[PDB]
């Protein structure tokens, strides 16, 4: 942190009453992803920070069901900015499984994503940008048992 060239990051999978997950669009684009923000100089800390700041939700309205014990992805060759030092080549990530506790009319897209939507559980594994695909596989795999319990 910030390393090896990796940058610490948190990711949020926000589960549902029915086992769905929140799929969000990225501002001014047609790409979709889970919320993910930086880790300032704790894991839980930045998640609630990126949670309230980008989604409009507080400790009130959610509850954390599980977390991962550092998942990396490298960026594609061409997207690495070697002229910015230190050189960042990818991300290290801790993921949190959340449960929306209050209601959809409380998801406030701003503040500072854009559009968001409920989506079946495994949909995001094949839908996110290529180079994040393998990280998405492992996080969704790990959380699968926890979510079904509902």
């Amino acid at each position: 942190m910030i390393d090896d060239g990796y940058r610490p990051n948190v990711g949020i999978v926000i589960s549902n009453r029915q086992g769905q997950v929140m799929w969000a669009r990225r501002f001014g684009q047609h790409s979709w992803q889970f919320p993910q923000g930086g880790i300032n100089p704790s894991a839980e800390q930045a998640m609630y920070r990126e949670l309230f700041e980008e989604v409009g939700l507080s400790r009130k309205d959610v509850r954390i069901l599980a977390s991962t014990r550092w998942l990396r992805y490298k960026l594609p060759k061409r997207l690495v900015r070697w002229d910015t030092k230190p050189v960042c080549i990818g991300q290290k990530q801790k993921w949190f499984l959340l449960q929306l506790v209050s209601g959809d009319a409380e998801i406030n897209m701003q503040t500072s994503f854009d559009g968001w939507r409920w989506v079946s559980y495994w949909y995001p594994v094949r839908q996110v940008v290529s180079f994040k695909r393998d990280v998405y596989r492992r996080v969704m795999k790990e959380f699968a048992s926890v979510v079904m319990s509902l």
Binding site: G19, W23, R117, W118, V119, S120, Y121, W122, Y123, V125, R126, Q127, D134, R137, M140, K141, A144, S145, M148
Partner: protein
């Protein structure tokens, strides 16, 4: 790579979780895995995948022992549905899935049987395809000196169904090849030998297109009930006893889809280091 060996009434599959695993195939690799002495051994490979529609639960894809994709309604659907439950990919008993050419809801019943929507039986000869003057409940086919009475229907593949006195004595091995490649079937036909026991129960044997007789042909069971029904022989819920076991068919006649409920068995789990 983890996989499971499964079968529905003897129709056997290598089943791969491509949801939680990164898995790659080529036609040649599939031919090498299907080989029963040199590989895993299976008739078809079923690849289970994340959905590509936010409202479905999975997608799945099937390849045959030659390494080419198969696009046949309900093919592998009962093994797919028990697999996703057995391996913890889902909890649902109503599972929504897309396939090569469609979209369907699978119901896994409390006794571990799977109910499949097979679509609507299509009796028009041009859709089978079947060379004929027009649609008829019964057809006369000339097979050398033998005269054959049959019904013909499409389940998305072609079926010729022949009512017999006893499946055990039916000439499956001699008349099947004759009819299977008859001139009036330009794309060949699955040849069913249906013995009616009661309006609710038939015994069946099928000489399948290209492959001859096996322990169980799911679409032929559907075609037999569909034909038996529209010839007034069968009730709208029929029990079908095949060499390899039992299916149950439910159809309410034209305007309604036909349903097939049957079993699926998990045999073993495998690991192979491609």
């Amino acid at each position: 790579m983890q996989f499971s060996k499964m079968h529905g009434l003897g129709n056997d599959f290598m089943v791969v979780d491509a949801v939680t695993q990164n898995v790659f195939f080529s036609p040649e690799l599939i031919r090498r895995l299907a080989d029963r002495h040199l590989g895993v051994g299976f008739d078809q490979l079923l690849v289970v995948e994340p959905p590509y529609d936010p409202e479905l639960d999975f997608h799945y894809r099937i390849f045959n022992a030659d390494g080419s994709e198969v696009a046949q309604c309900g093919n592998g659907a009962r093994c797919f549905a028990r697999f996703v439950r057995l391996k913890g990919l889902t909890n649902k008993r109503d599972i929504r899935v897309s396939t090569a050419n469609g979209r369907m809801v699978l119901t896994v019943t409390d006794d571990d049987l799977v109910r499949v929507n097979m679509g609507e039986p299509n009796f028009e000869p041009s859709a089978v395809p079947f060379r004929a003057n027009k649609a008829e409940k019964t057809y006369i086919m000339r097979a050398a000196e033998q005269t054959i009475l049959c019904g013909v229907v499409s389940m998305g593949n072609p079926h010729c169904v022949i009512q017999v006195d006893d499946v055990d004595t039916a000439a499956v091995e001699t008349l099947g090849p004759v009819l299977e490649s008859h001139e009036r079937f330009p794309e060949r036909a699955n040849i069913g030998f249906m013995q009616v026991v009661k309006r609710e129960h038939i015994r069946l044997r099928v000489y399948e297109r290209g492959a001859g007789e096996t322990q169980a042909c799911g679409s032929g069971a559907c075609a037999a009930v569909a034909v038996g029904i529209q010839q007034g022989l069968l009730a709208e819920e029929v029990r079908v006893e095949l060499p390899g076991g039992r299916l149950d068919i439910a159809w309410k006649g034209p305007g309604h889809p036909l349903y097939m409920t049957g079993p699926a068995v998990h045999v073993y789990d495998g690991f192979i280091h491609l």
